[PDB]
Amino acid sequence: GIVEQCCTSICSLYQLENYCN
Amino acid sequence: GIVEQCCTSICSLYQLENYCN
């Protein structure tokens, strides 16, 4: 989801926006 | 809301649960 996706090799700045509110 | 409430004098363990999902 987000943990296993960003805590594996860090997500990209744009990828983090997808989770922004 | 939550920042001004817990970043002023720290909230209580039970108070944080209110924001839990």
Place this chain on the structure above:
Amino acid sequence: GIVEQCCTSICSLYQLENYCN
């Protein structure tokens, strides 16, 4: 002791109390 016990898979809230003063 405590590091190898909680830095392996995180200890439980009650397990941390054992180390509380």
Place this chain on the structure above:
Amino acid sequence: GIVEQCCTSICSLYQLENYCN
């Protein structure tokens, strides 16, 4: 310089780039 500038009200994303290498 940078500390008194970003540790007062947080700098902007573009302002931080100025210090990037």
Place this chain on the structure above:
Amino acid sequence: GIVEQCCTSICSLYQLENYCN
């Protein structure tokens, strides 16, 4: 004690040793 002493203006490296075990 230690919090009000080091969380006011940061303690010195030698001052922290006094609390070392």
Place this chain on the structure above:
Amino acid sequence: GIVEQCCTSICSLYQLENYCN
């Protein structure tokens, strides 16, 4: 350089000074 050197087994206090400004 410094990341792969200190993020592998932590560098020594003197080793960090080499990177100090």
Place this chain on the structure above:
Amino acid sequence: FVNQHLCGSHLVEALYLVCGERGFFYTPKT
């Protein structure tokens, strides 16, 4: 004294710590 943008980063650490595996919604905006 930059708080909120720097304080919230640590409020969340305790938030999901109390929730454990559960999740939570963090909105740093009154």
Place this chain on the structure above:
Amino acid sequence: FVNQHLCGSHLVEALYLVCGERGFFYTPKT
């Protein structure tokens, strides 16, 4: 290597940093 419960605490720091004043929902549970 305790991750997730210890890793997420810092993923959120960058999350609301990119959002700035906006908020976000963090659910550390597949």
Place this chain on the structure above:
Amino acid sequence: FVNQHLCGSHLVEALYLVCGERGFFYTPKT
């Protein structure tokens, strides 16, 4: 994967968080 010297720094954050005002002894040495 530098742990312990870097991991303990955050284990203590949750330690005194659970203790609240109480204190605790942290010895990162088997």
Place this chain on the structure above:
Amino acid sequence: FVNQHLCGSHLVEALYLVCGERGFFYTPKT
């Protein structure tokens, strides 16, 4: 300005950093 409960979490990081492998007792209570 929530300090102590949020400040001590980082004072300990430098504490055991100076001690290295040694340990220390942290009591956030005057």
Place this chain on the structure above:
Amino acid sequence: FVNQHLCGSHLVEALYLVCGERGFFYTPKT
């Protein structure tokens, strides 16, 4: 309110986060 010596430690976290792989020079001394 110990800032700078304690605040800079987190300003750098966002610094190299914005730089990504690039580096940066941090001098906490006016």
Place this chain on the structure above:
Amino acid sequence: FVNQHLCGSHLVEALYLVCGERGFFYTPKT
């Protein structure tokens, strides 16, 4: 195990802690 981009953020905390008021150059790029 996301390191470097997440590990360096804490290596710098000890870096300027050892330097005190001095500064340092951090380049997370071999």
